[PDB]
Amino acid sequence: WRLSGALCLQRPPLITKALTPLQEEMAGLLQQIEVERSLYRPGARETEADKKNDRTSLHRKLDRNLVLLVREKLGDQDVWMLPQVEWQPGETLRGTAERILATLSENNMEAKFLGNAPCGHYKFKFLGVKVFFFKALLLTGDFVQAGKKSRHVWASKEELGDYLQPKYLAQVRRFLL
Amino acid sequence: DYEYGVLNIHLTAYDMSLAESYAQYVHRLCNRLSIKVEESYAMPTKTMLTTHERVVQISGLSATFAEIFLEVLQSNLPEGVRLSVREHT
Amino acid sequence: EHSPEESERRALLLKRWALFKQQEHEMERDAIRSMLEAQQEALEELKLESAELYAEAIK
RNA sequence: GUUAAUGUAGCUUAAUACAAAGCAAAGCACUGAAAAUGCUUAGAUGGAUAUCCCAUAAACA
Known part of the structure; x- marks a missing residue:
């Protein structure tokens, strides 16, 4: 059996939508009492303005979340894939997950693996693979x-x-935000 | 047998009321999702102007639960509040 | 002092704000269940192929 | 299509009678926090009969 590991990376949305003007007047009101009752180079909001086409760049969007998606080539297949790598039984999922972070992307991205439990598994058969x-x-x-x-x-x-x-690859949305 | 540790959230905002409002709001998020909050301690002012930091203790998370919760907090972000997640001493 | 029309205008937006939040909470709760169900469903899938693989994973 | 699921609102075989009920759950007010408490918010027969039924989703296919 061919053992293949993949990682569905999640990128946070940096900036939420602006507050409504009706909130601002209330915000001003609470600020005034807040002072009375008080007890004792920046990056661009959107860095896509210059690029307009850099799907490759991590910062393809800043207002919304992003998930890495990398074209991959297999021995008998060449299809657009979620970040994929070959893994072994000795390595745990987080270890396989960590290797994907540096192997495919070879970058100093900051990620933390809190839960070892995997979220999705899909099998494509012609040779059994997962x-x-x-x-x-x-x-x-x-x-x-x-x-x-x-x-x-x-x-x-x-x-x-x-x-x-395919649903084996289009059902990743089920555990995605 | 391992479970998510208790991670404190230090809500730092220049506005005292906004941090308190968010601290109460996030706690309302916590209890609805069944998140236990043991304490709501307040840090001293960050004398340099000053800023106010309020603790929202969070105990108990799950792999799927943690991923959903953190993004919801980011979306819940009202204005100019810096989120923080740190393991409890 | 706020006028009754101002209170009526503010009364409406609180209803809209509450409606938006309750919708978000219902969606958020479903998201927790859907991901947990998918994660639990994910656990079963590989177990059939090889239970030994999870032995490292569960640690 | 064969097997099989799934078809009152998170939950319930509450109910088809005299009501689509009870329960879980929410917002705001009250300022350690929570709870309590007051005022308030959103809701369903996707559908029948005493098994078909179409929709949906699986192993057969």
Whole structure:
């Protein structure tokens, strides 16, 4: 059997929508009492303005969340895949998950693996194979080599359907936000 | 037998009321999701202007539960509050 | 002092705010269950293929 | 299509009678927090009969 591991990376949305003006006037009111009752170079809000086409760059979007999606090549297949790597029984899922972070992306991205339990598994057969879909949280991401020759794409769910058609790959949305 | 440790959330915001409002709001998020909150301690002012930091203790998480919760907190972010997750001493 | 129209205008937005939040909470609760069900469903899938693999994973 | 599921609102075989009920659950107010407490918010027969039924989703296919 061919053992293959994959990682469904999650990128946080940096900035939420602006508050309504009706909230602002209330915010001003509470601020005034707050003082009375008180007891004793920045990055651009959106860094896509210059790029407009850098799907490769980690910062494809800042207002919304993103999920890494990397074109992968197998021995007999070449299809658009979620970050995929070959793993062994000795290595645990987090160890396989950690290897995916540096192997495929070769970057100093900041990720923490809190839960060893995997979120998704889908099998494609023609040779029996299975793909492991892990989940993790990103506080921040430092993606080196933005312009790689590979087709790595950071898209949460909008492009998941476009690039991952079959339910074995289009059902990743089930455990996605 | 291992379970998620108790991780304190230090809500730092220049506005005292906003941190308190968010601290109460996030706690309302916590109890609804069945998150136990043992304490709501308050840090001293960050004398330099000053800022106010309020603790919201969180005990008990799950792998799927943690992933969903943290994004919800980010979306819940009203204005100019810095989230923080740190393992309890 | 706020006028009755101002209170009526504010009364409406609180209803909208409450409606939005309750919808978010219901969606959030379903998200917890859906991911947990998928994660639990994910656990079963590999167990059939090889239980030995999870032995490292569960640690 | 064969087997098989699944078809009152988180839960219930509460109910088809005199009501689509009870329960879980929510917002705001009250300022350690929570709870308590007051005022309030959102809801369902996707559907029949005394098994078909279409929808849905699986092993057969």
